[PDB]
């Protein structure tokens, strides 16, 4: 059983590049946006419940 | 001979008189030096369940 | 001081307790001076312990700390990784805490390990090396009556 749910973050900025864009988003930026947006959504779902 | 001398460290300029001093004696960058948030590792691991 | 057999015992204990693995093995690359890595767990250590981990020797008297520079190719380097030992990949958390003055008293025969003052008496310092397995804990956030949590 291989589960990766506590792995210490994805690769850093210097790793592999999928696209040819000059500036690439990388996974850290996306997960940071998700963790920034989650507190409001968590407060909202209470009313639905 | 009008000499600049050294306005700081107690020596007035020649042009100045009994009651005066250079108004500007230094230059200010106005770009402060600041640190950054120390990185955190354990916080992203945990999920959150509301109460 | 931590030893190789302690790491093997910890692996055996975690295997017996059915703790799921977190990574996959690394087959070698084609570049010269590149060695394979078999390691399936992540362990978080402080900054001060790393030299001792580097000085370790395995059962047959060889090196036991393969640094990230060897297997950076054909692998996925995580944040703060410094190398791999046995089955544990090492993560160097900058903010790793430690109990201060929690060991037995320190006399003048101290080989060189760190100590601290406790009521006018020397005591050694105890440092942690932690492994967080899958689905071990969750955080609780009280509603706060309308605030955007946090």
Short mmCIF file of C-alpha atoms in Angstrom, two decimals:
data_model
loop_
_atom_site.label_atom_id
_atom_site.label_comp_id
_atom_site.label_asym_id
_atom_site.label_seq_id
_atom_site.Cartn_x
_atom_site.Cartn_y
_atom_site.Cartn_z
CA UNK A 1 0.00 0.00 0.00
CA UNK A 2 1.61 3.22 -1.26
CA UNK A 3 -0.18 6.37 -0.17
CA UNK A 4 1.46 9.80 -0.38
CA UNK A 5 -0.60 12.09 1.85
CA UNK A 6 2.08 13.32 4.28
CA UNK A 7 4.96 13.76 1.81
CA UNK A 8 6.91 16.97 2.64
CA UNK A 9 5.60 19.04 -0.26
CA UNK A 10 6.17 18.49 -3.99
CA UNK A 11 9.39 19.22 -5.85
CA UNK A 12 10.95 22.67 -5.36
CA UNK A 13 11.20 25.27 -8.12
CA UNK A 14 14.23 23.57 -9.70
CA UNK A 15 12.98 20.25 -11.08
CA UNK A 16 11.35 19.45 -14.43
CA UNK A 17 9.45 21.68 -16.82
CA UNK A 18 6.41 20.54 -18.82
CA UNK A 19 5.82 23.58 -21.03
CA UNK A 20 7.96 26.09 -22.92
CA UNK A 21 6.56 29.15 -21.13
CA UNK A 22 9.07 31.64 -19.74
CA UNK A 23 7.26 31.66 -16.38
CA UNK A 24 5.80 28.36 -15.19
CA UNK A 25 3.38 28.06 -12.30
CA UNK A 26 4.85 24.95 -10.54
CA UNK A 27 2.88 22.91 -8.00
CA UNK A 28 3.77 24.93 -4.89
CA UNK A 29 1.98 28.03 -6.18
CA UNK A 30 -1.21 26.07 -6.91
CA UNK A 31 -1.25 24.36 -3.52
CA UNK A 32 -0.57 27.70 -1.83
CA UNK A 33 -3.57 29.21 -3.63
CA UNK A 34 -5.68 26.23 -2.57
CA UNK A 35 -4.67 26.54 1.09
CA UNK A 36 -5.32 30.28 0.93
CA UNK A 37 -8.81 29.84 -0.52
CA UNK A 38 -9.88 26.89 1.64
CA UNK A 39 -10.67 28.80 4.90
CA UNK A 40 -13.54 30.75 3.30
CA UNK A 41 -15.03 27.69 1.58
CA UNK A 42 -14.88 25.76 4.86
CA UNK A 43 -16.85 28.51 6.60
CA UNK A 44 -19.39 28.56 3.77
CA UNK A 45 -20.14 24.82 3.70
CA UNK A 46 -21.41 24.95 7.29
CA UNK A 47 -24.56 26.75 6.20
CA UNK A 48 -25.22 24.17 3.49
CA UNK A 49 -24.82 21.37 6.03
CA UNK B 1 38.99 80.70 1.53
CA UNK B 2 35.47 79.29 1.78
CA UNK B 3 36.08 75.73 3.00
CA UNK B 4 33.51 72.99 3.52
CA UNK B 5 35.27 71.71 6.69
CA UNK B 6 33.06 68.97 8.24
CA UNK B 7 29.56 69.98 9.39
CA UNK B 8 29.24 66.84 11.49
CA UNK B 9 31.73 66.04 14.26
CA UNK B 10 31.79 69.67 15.36
CA UNK B 11 33.35 71.94 12.75
CA UNK B 12 31.14 74.47 10.97
CA UNK B 13 31.52 75.38 7.31
CA UNK B 14 33.11 78.68 6.33
CA UNK B 15 29.99 80.20 4.76
CA UNK B 16 27.82 79.46 7.80
CA UNK B 17 27.72 81.97 10.61
CA UNK B 18 27.01 82.20 14.33
CA UNK B 19 23.54 80.60 14.10
CA UNK B 20 23.22 78.19 11.17
CA UNK B 21 24.12 74.73 9.91
CA UNK B 22 23.85 72.73 6.71
CA UNK B 23 20.26 71.61 6.26
CA UNK B 24 21.12 68.40 4.38
CA UNK B 25 24.10 66.38 5.62
CA UNK B 26 23.17 62.88 4.41
CA UNK B 27 21.13 61.05 1.79
CA UNK B 28 18.35 58.56 2.49
CA UNK B 29 17.78 55.50 0.30
CA UNK B 30 14.12 55.07 1.39
CA UNK B 31 14.23 51.33 0.52
CA UNK B 32 14.15 49.53 3.85
CA UNK B 33 15.84 46.17 4.42
CA UNK B 34 13.34 43.51 5.48
CA UNK B 35 13.37 39.79 6.17
CA UNK B 36 10.95 37.07 5.03
CA UNK B 37 8.58 34.59 6.63
CA UNK B 38 10.33 31.48 7.91
CA UNK B 39 9.17 28.45 5.95
CA UNK B 40 6.81 25.95 7.57
CA UNK B 41 6.57 22.24 6.83
CA UNK B 42 4.17 20.64 9.31
CA UNK B 43 1.20 22.93 8.67
CA UNK B 44 0.41 21.81 5.08
CA UNK B 45 0.36 18.17 6.22
CA UNK B 46 -2.75 18.45 8.39
CA UNK B 47 -6.29 18.61 7.08
CA UNK B 48 -9.06 20.35 9.01
CA UNK B 49 -12.42 19.08 10.26
CA UNK B 50 -14.89 21.73 11.36
CA UNK B 51 -16.68 21.78 14.70
CA UNK C 1 23.46 8.33 19.88
CA UNK C 2 21.28 7.07 17.04
CA UNK C 3 22.68 4.01 15.28
CA UNK C 4 21.95 2.01 12.15
CA UNK C 5 20.29 -0.85 14.02
CA UNK C 6 17.88 1.65 15.58
CA UNK C 7 16.78 2.69 12.09
CA UNK C 8 16.31 -0.95 11.08
CA UNK C 9 14.28 -1.60 14.24
CA UNK C 10 12.08 1.42 13.52
CA UNK C 11 11.46 0.13 10.00
CA UNK C 12 10.54 -3.30 11.36
CA UNK C 13 8.16 -1.81 13.93
CA UNK C 14 6.43 0.36 11.34
CA UNK C 15 6.08 -2.63 9.01
CA UNK C 16 4.53 -4.74 11.78
CA UNK C 17 2.08 -1.95 12.67
CA UNK C 18 0.84 -1.93 9.03
CA UNK C 19 1.87 1.68 8.35
CA UNK C 20 1.53 2.49 4.63
CA UNK C 21 4.61 3.49 2.67
CA UNK C 22 4.97 7.01 1.27
CA UNK C 23 7.34 6.80 -1.73
CA UNK C 24 8.70 4.38 -4.34
CA UNK C 25 12.16 2.98 -5.01
CA UNK C 26 14.55 4.72 -7.41
CA UNK C 27 16.20 2.76 -10.19
CA UNK C 28 19.50 4.15 -11.37
CA UNK C 29 20.17 6.62 -14.16
CA UNK C 30 22.74 6.34 -16.96
CA UNK C 31 25.12 9.09 -15.80
CA UNK C 32 28.45 8.06 -14.30
CA UNK C 33 28.75 7.96 -10.50
CA UNK C 34 25.02 7.51 -9.86
CA UNK C 35 23.72 4.99 -7.33
CA UNK C 36 20.25 3.55 -6.84
CA UNK C 37 18.11 4.37 -3.80
CA UNK C 38 15.78 2.00 -2.03
CA UNK C 39 13.83 4.07 0.48
CA UNK C 40 10.13 4.18 1.14
CA UNK C 41 9.62 6.51 4.14
CA UNK C 42 10.24 10.15 5.03
CA UNK C 43 11.82 11.22 8.32
CA UNK C 44 12.04 14.81 9.56
CA UNK C 45 15.20 15.76 11.45
CA UNK C 46 16.62 18.97 12.85
CA UNK C 47 19.55 20.90 11.46
CA UNK C 48 22.01 19.98 14.21
CA UNK C 49 21.69 16.21 13.86
CA UNK C 50 22.77 16.04 10.20
CA UNK C 51 26.55 15.63 10.78
CA UNK C 52 25.98 12.60 13.01
CA UNK C 53 23.73 11.08 10.35
CA UNK C 54 26.49 11.69 7.80
CA UNK C 55 29.12 9.99 9.95
CA UNK C 56 27.14 6.73 10.21
CA UNK C 57 28.41 3.39 8.91
CA UNK C 58 26.25 0.44 7.91
CA UNK C 59 26.66 -3.19 8.97
CA UNK C 60 29.64 -4.02 6.75
CA UNK C 61 31.56 -0.80 7.39
CA UNK C 62 30.65 1.34 4.36
CA UNK C 63 28.89 4.66 3.96
CA UNK C 64 25.20 4.83 4.82
CA UNK C 65 24.31 8.41 3.76
CA UNK C 66 23.69 8.75 0.04
CA UNK C 67 23.44 12.46 -0.68
CA UNK C 68 20.90 14.01 -3.04
CA UNK C 69 23.64 14.90 -5.52
CA UNK C 70 24.07 11.25 -6.53
CA UNK C 71 20.44 10.44 -7.35
CA UNK C 72 19.05 13.87 -8.24
CA UNK C 73 18.79 12.54 -11.78
CA UNK C 74 16.05 9.93 -12.32
CA UNK C 75 14.31 10.96 -9.11
CA UNK C 76 12.05 13.50 -7.44
CA UNK C 77 13.85 15.75 -4.96
CA UNK C 78 11.51 17.02 -2.25
CA UNK C 79 11.80 20.31 -0.38
CA UNK C 80 14.59 20.35 2.16
CA UNK C 81 15.85 16.86 1.34
CA UNK C 82 19.50 16.27 2.23
CA UNK C 83 19.95 12.57 1.50
CA UNK C 84 18.75 9.04 2.14
CA UNK C 85 19.69 6.49 4.80
CA UNK C 86 18.58 2.85 4.87
CA UNK C 87 14.89 3.18 3.96
CA UNK C 88 14.29 6.72 5.29
CA UNK C 89 14.65 9.82 3.15
CA UNK C 90 15.88 12.70 5.30
CA UNK C 91 14.13 16.07 5.50
CA UNK C 92 15.85 18.97 7.28
CA UNK C 93 13.14 21.09 8.91
CA UNK C 94 14.72 24.45 9.86
CA UNK C 95 12.36 25.01 12.82
CA UNK C 96 12.73 21.61 14.48
CA UNK C 97 12.34 21.99 18.24
CA UNK C 98 14.18 20.09 20.97
CA UNK C 99 13.96 19.55 24.71
CA UNK C 100 16.59 21.55 26.59
CA UNK C 101 18.36 20.20 29.65
CA UNK C 102 16.31 17.01 29.77
CA UNK C 103 19.08 14.39 29.94
CA UNK C 104 21.30 13.19 32.74
CA UNK C 105 23.86 15.56 34.22
CA UNK C 106 27.05 16.33 32.30
CA UNK C 107 30.45 16.01 33.95
CA UNK C 108 33.89 16.94 32.60
CA UNK C 109 34.18 13.73 30.59
CA UNK C 110 31.78 15.14 27.97
CA UNK C 111 33.07 13.86 24.59
CA UNK C 112 31.60 16.95 22.96
CA UNK C 113 27.82 16.65 22.80
CA UNK C 114 25.61 19.67 23.47
CA UNK C 115 24.48 20.55 27.00
CA UNK C 116 22.48 23.31 28.68
CA UNK C 117 22.04 24.95 32.08
CA UNK C 118 19.32 23.69 34.42
CA UNK C 119 19.35 25.20 37.93
CA UNK C 120 23.12 25.62 37.90
CA UNK C 121 23.72 22.04 36.71
CA UNK C 122 24.64 20.81 33.25
CA UNK C 123 22.19 18.54 31.44
CA UNK C 124 22.30 17.10 27.94
CA UNK C 125 19.90 18.12 25.18
CA UNK C 126 17.46 15.60 23.68
CA UNK C 127 16.64 15.95 19.98
CA UNK C 128 13.79 14.40 17.97
CA UNK C 129 13.70 12.48 14.69
CA UNK C 130 10.09 12.11 13.63
CA UNK C 131 8.15 10.12 11.02
CA UNK C 132 4.54 11.10 10.33
CA UNK C 133 2.60 8.20 8.86
CA UNK C 134 -0.47 8.37 6.68
CA UNK C 135 -3.74 9.55 8.24
CA UNK C 136 -2.43 10.13 11.75
CA UNK C 137 -4.22 13.34 12.76
CA UNK C 138 -6.46 16.21 11.69
CA UNK C 139 -6.80 19.80 12.88
CA UNK C 140 -9.94 21.27 14.43
CA UNK C 141 -11.24 24.72 13.59
CA UNK C 142 -14.01 26.20 15.70
CA UNK C 143 -16.55 28.26 13.81
CA UNK C 144 -15.91 31.54 15.71
CA UNK C 145 -19.47 32.75 14.92
CA UNK C 146 -19.18 34.02 11.37
CA UNK C 147 -15.47 34.82 11.02
CA UNK C 148 -13.56 33.38 8.09
CA UNK C 149 -12.01 30.81 10.45
CA UNK C 150 -8.24 30.98 11.03
#
